[PDB]
Design an enzyme around this catalytic site. Structure first.
Site, PDB file in Angstrom:
ATOM      1  N   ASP A  88     -15.019 -21.946  62.037  1.00 10.02           N
ATOM      2  CA  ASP A  88     -15.221 -23.171  62.799  1.00 10.02           C
ATOM      3  C   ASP A  88     -15.779 -24.177  61.779  1.00 10.02           C
ATOM      4  O   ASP A  88     -16.259 -23.768  60.720  1.00 10.02           O
ATOM      5  CB  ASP A  88     -16.245 -22.919  63.920  1.00 10.02           C
ATOM      6  N   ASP A  90     -18.036 -27.492  62.499  1.00  9.86           N
ATOM      7  CA  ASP A  90     -19.398 -27.959  62.731  1.00  9.86           C
ATOM      8  C   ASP A  90     -20.398 -26.816  62.921  1.00  9.86           C
ATOM      9  O   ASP A  90     -20.158 -25.901  63.689  1.00  9.86           O
ATOM     10  CB  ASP A  90     -19.453 -28.894  63.937  1.00  9.86           C
ATOM     11  N   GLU A  97     -23.152 -31.622  62.577  1.00 13.24           N
ATOM     12  CA  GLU A  97     -22.214 -31.907  63.635  1.00 13.24           C
ATOM     13  C   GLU A  97     -21.527 -33.255  63.361  1.00 13.24           C
ATOM     14  O   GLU A  97     -22.090 -34.308  63.615  1.00 13.24           O
ATOM     15  CB  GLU A  97     -22.924 -31.988  64.977  1.00 13.24           C
ATOM     16  N   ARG A 133     -16.582 -39.097  73.681  1.00 17.99           N
ATOM     17  CA  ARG A 133     -17.274 -39.340  72.416  1.00 17.99           C
ATOM     18  C   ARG A 133     -16.383 -40.031  71.402  1.00 17.99           C
ATOM     19  O   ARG A 133     -16.828 -40.926  70.678  1.00 17.99           O
ATOM     20  CB  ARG A 133     -17.852 -38.037  71.854  1.00 17.99           C
ATOM     21  N   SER A 176     -11.040 -25.798  64.322  1.00 10.72           N
ATOM     22  CA  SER A 176     -12.135 -26.585  64.873  1.00 10.72           C
ATOM     23  C   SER A 176     -11.700 -27.634  65.916  1.00 10.72           C
ATOM     24  O   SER A 176     -10.594 -28.189  65.828  1.00 10.72           O
ATOM     25  CB  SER A 176     -12.805 -27.346  63.719  1.00 10.72           C
ATOM     26  N   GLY A 177     -12.603 -27.922  66.861  1.00 12.53           N
ATOM     27  CA  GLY A 177     -12.437 -29.010  67.844  1.00 12.53           C
ATOM     28  C   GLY A 177     -12.795 -30.387  67.305  1.00 12.53           C
ATOM     29  O   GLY A 177     -12.820 -31.360  68.054  1.00 12.53           O
ATOM     30  N   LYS A 221      -8.127 -22.820  70.041  1.00 16.07           N
ATOM     31  CA  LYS A 221      -8.601 -22.390  68.736  1.00 16.07           C
ATOM     32  C   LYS A 221      -8.165 -20.951  68.526  1.00 16.07           C
ATOM     33  O   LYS A 221      -7.675 -20.575  67.459  1.00 16.07           O
ATOM     34  CB  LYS A 221     -10.115 -22.579  68.621  1.00 16.07           C
ATOM     35  N   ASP A 244     -20.358 -20.435  65.590  1.00 14.76           N
ATOM     36  CA  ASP A 244     -21.709 -20.511  66.111  1.00 14.76           C
ATOM     37  C   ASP A 244     -21.774 -20.787  67.628  1.00 14.76           C
ATOM     38  O   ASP A 244     -22.779 -20.454  68.270  1.00 14.76           O
ATOM     39  CB  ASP A 244     -22.429 -21.675  65.459  1.00 14.76           C
TER      40      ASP A 244
END
Ligand SMILES: [Cl-]
Ligand code: NA
Length: 291
Positions: A88, A90, A97, A133, A176-177, A221, A244
């Protein structure tokens, strides 16, 4: 082969730790203290009957590792080999982040942190968390983003371990997102083989809100990992994934060897390979057989 192996890594004097752990733990117990030069790590290796490793025995080892603060690994069998290691981004590959960092750079930490508020509280969907966001960042100049990316820090041990991963015939991936500008930049910056994330178009040199659909959520993912392993013809037991956060669970549960890195409580509970007190140098124990 009805034997199991557990490696223990600790800052405590290794003889003290062995002594202390025999007494607390209690067939034949083989304890060998060794030094992996390649990652400059002295560890304790324990060989014990496979029958011993039981869910109750794990639970207790884990709780103990949190009270005395050591890391350990139960050597997988078979050991992963010539596979993939996915990370991943972040709070895994990098300490930070990405989107939060962009927010703070822009004076919007409260707005953005609030959207995070709603999603975590379950008030809002994660995709809608991501879209919202990203929507808050419309107009951000490529240069601010690049600058933010530049000040991001590699998580400890990756410089040491990455060349070794390669020497051992594994492919590396980021999955990753997060933003592609960060993901691709990190990939190129560190020679990673693959890199996949959400894509947000940048036009006239400023961030748009044109997000590529479907969005890279948690299930995607995993699916990216599956599809990559298919393409590379890599068996699941040879897939290592590290993460994480909750949006990493599907991907980590799917991997043959899933690793929770300094993870959220809900992750530490489903995923039993963990790094809690050292860096990614420790991935050695899951890819080097000669230890
Ligand atoms: Cl994000
Ligand atoms: Na993460």
């Amino acid at each position: 082969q009805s034997m199991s192996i557990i490696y223990f890594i600790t800052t405590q004097d290794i003889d003290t730790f062995q002594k202390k752990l025999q007494e607390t733990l209690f067939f034949p117990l083989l304890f060998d203290k060794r030094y992996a030069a390649l990652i400059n790590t002295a560890y304790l290796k324990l060989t014990l009957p496979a029958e011993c490793l039981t869910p109750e025995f794990y639970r207790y080892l884990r709780e103990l590792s949190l009270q005395w603060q050591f890391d350990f690994f139960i050597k997988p069998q078979p050991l992963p080999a010539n596979g993939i290691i996915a990370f991943d981004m972040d709070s895994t590959f990098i300490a930070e982040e990405g989107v939060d960092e962009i927010a703070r750079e822009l004076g919007m930490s409260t707005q953005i942190t609030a959207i995070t508020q709603q999603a975590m509280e379950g008030k809002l969907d994660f995709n809608a968390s991501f879209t919202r966001r990203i929507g808050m960042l419309k107009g951000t100049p490529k240069a601010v983003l690049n600058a933010v990316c530049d000040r991001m820090t590699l998580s400890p041990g990756l410089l040491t371990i990455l060349p070794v991963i390669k020497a051992k015939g594994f492919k590396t991936a980021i999955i990753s997102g997060g933003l592609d500008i960060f993901t691709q930049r990190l990939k190129a910056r560190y020679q990673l083989d693959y890199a996949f994330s959400n894509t947000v178009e940048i036009r006239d040199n400023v961030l748009t809100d044109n997000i590529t659909l479907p969005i890279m959520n948690a299930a995607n993912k995993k699916q990216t990992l599956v599809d990559l392993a298919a393409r590379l013809n890599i068996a699941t037991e040879n897939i290592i994934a590290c993460g994480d956060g909750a949006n990493d669970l599907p991907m980590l549960e799917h991997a043959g060897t899933g690793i929770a890195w300094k993870a959220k409580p809900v992750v530490r509970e489903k995923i039993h390979h963990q790094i809690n007190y050292h860096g990614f140098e420790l991935l050695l124990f899951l890819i080097e057989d000669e230890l």
